[model samples]
Target: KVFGRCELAAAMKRHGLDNYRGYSLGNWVCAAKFESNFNTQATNRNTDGSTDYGILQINSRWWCNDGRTPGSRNLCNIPCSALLSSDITASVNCAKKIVSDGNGMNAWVAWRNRCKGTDVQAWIRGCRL
Candidate 1:
């Protein structure tokens, strides 16, 4: 499912992303837009043979197990396929782990480049969250 911006904001907030790790809901929304355009099934294969999965583009190299990614730690204990599901619970949970592991939102280059220190309120504008 390709989530509309406000819909994703509401969903993510419901799942406890709002103000997580000192980042606002708008920050999460902005990162997701740049990462996958809110498409649940988005995947990007890196030249290094790892893949990023799902709406947030959580990586196979460390977070999820794809079997094809060599030396995968599967630190999140989830199959990479889990991240592709429209439910997004697994994706959100895995992302939380990534952040809590001290990587914070910097784990995603998209977030660092696009959302960090930006006024992301526009990402959630008009959303009644």
Candidate 2:
């Protein structure tokens, strides 16, 4: 499922991403936009045998178990495929875990290059949250 900009924002906010860990919902929205264009099944295979899955692109090597990454930590204790679902609960939970682990939003390179410390409120503008 490919979510519209405001649609994704509302869903993320519903899961408590609005102000999770001091990052605004706009930050999340922007990151997801650049990361996967809000596509639930988006996947990116890394050169290090790790794969990034789903909207926020949770990584197999550290976040989810894909059974292919050489040294997967599976810190989220979830199957990589779970993140690919349109349900988005697992993806949001894993994202929260990633931030709570002190990696911060910088864990996603797309956030660093596109959303970090920027005025991303426009990403959520007009969305009735």
Candidate 3:
């Protein structure tokens, strides 16, 4: 099977990122690689006591549950199982929105700052768009 690299790149561009830093993309891809081997349809049960799901390992309970939506019973409304059905580009786009409101890659910056001991740009080269 072919990886959705082009689709993902296109989605990032559509979302306003023209270039990807090795650090940011690497880390993000690393997470996805580690979590799901870049599989957009990957899902994990909260067997480890943490509810991580999807490419960005989003916690369905935090965003979809807790009675946050306009009309929903709980986060289960957007369960990981359903999120797994989304395409990779769609998944990354959603993760970007959750991390940053289309602003500078603050979420990526934060992640690099904590995990890699490097400035966000150093990790990702620099932000574009």
lDDT of 3 by residue, 1-129 (tens): 224544443444564444343234544543444455556555554643444555555655444442322343322345444446555544554565455544333443334444444432332343342
The TM-score, computed over Cα atoms with residue i paired to residue i, of candidate 3 is 0.48
lDDT tens string, model 2, 1-129? 999999999899999998899999999999999999999999999989799999999999899998899867999999999999989999999999998887789989999998987899989989988
What are the models' TM-scores? Answer: 0.97, 0.97, 0.48
- Give the 10-residue window scoring lowest on summed lDDT in candidate 2: 99-108
| Candidate 3 C-alpha error for residue 114, in Å | 11
| Per-residue lDDT value at 47 in model 2 | 88
Query: How many steric clashes does model 2 contain?
Result: 0
lDDT of each: 0.93, 0.93, 0.46
- How well does model 3 score by local distance difference test? 0.46
